Amino acid sequence: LPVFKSLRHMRQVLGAPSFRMLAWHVLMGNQVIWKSRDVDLVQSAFEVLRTMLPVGCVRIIPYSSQYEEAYRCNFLGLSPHVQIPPHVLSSEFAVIVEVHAAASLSKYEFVVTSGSPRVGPTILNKIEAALTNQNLSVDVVDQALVALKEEWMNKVKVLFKFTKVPKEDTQKLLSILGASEEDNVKLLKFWMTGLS
């Protein structure tokens, strides 16, 4: 009963700024750390978050008793008293979500942190915007995410096929495809790991 049910639910619970920072890290392939007493809640978090990535981009250690580095996983679950190394705590390339009992999910308080820095990537804005509109049916949200994800994976394919070979050509192509901006370029690079 105390689990995340959707992206939208997760957004309601964590809050808008926190969700956006969390989602940006998921999308870019940065390490996502969840520290909780509750194994199932954490599993539900990952089940929800993974829907934002191509299935090939997911490497999960669901509930570890020690910190594991990024090469080990991009999704990491943790026991409550596990200690996170300083480089992680201050990293701009990881996000930590810590769950505690508070004084759906009312009994928990969530704190989301990351090393301090943005505008994109585009799929994030589009995803956040869909979650935002409370007038959206669940099926619409779900089907839109699938589509959005597919559109972005296609761009990855197009980009891979294209750079099988000037160099300024790539930016030009990307520009037509609406994917020239710095974050979009970073996302495509990461998403390419989800392809052979």
Numbering used by the authors: 343 to 445, 459 to 472, 477 to 524, 528 to 558
Manuscript excerpt for this entry:
Birt–Hogg–Dubé syndrome (BHD) is an inherited genetic disorder that predisposes individuals to renal cell carcinoma (RCC), benign skin tumours and lung cysts that lead to recurrent spontaneous pneumothorax. In BHD patients, the most common germline mutation that can lead to RCCs occurs in the mutation hotspot, exon 11, of the FLCN gene, and produces a truncated folliculin protein that lacks the C-terminal half. In this study, we use structural and biochemical analyses to show that folliculin is probably a distant relative of the differentially expressed in normal cells and neoplasia (DENN) family of guanine nucleotide exchange factors (GEFs) and demonstrate that it possesses in vitro nucleotide exchange activity towards Rab35 GTPase. Through structure–function analyses, we report that folliculin, which is commonly mutated in patients suffering from these malignancies, has an unusual architecture that classes it into an ancient family of proteins called the DENNs.
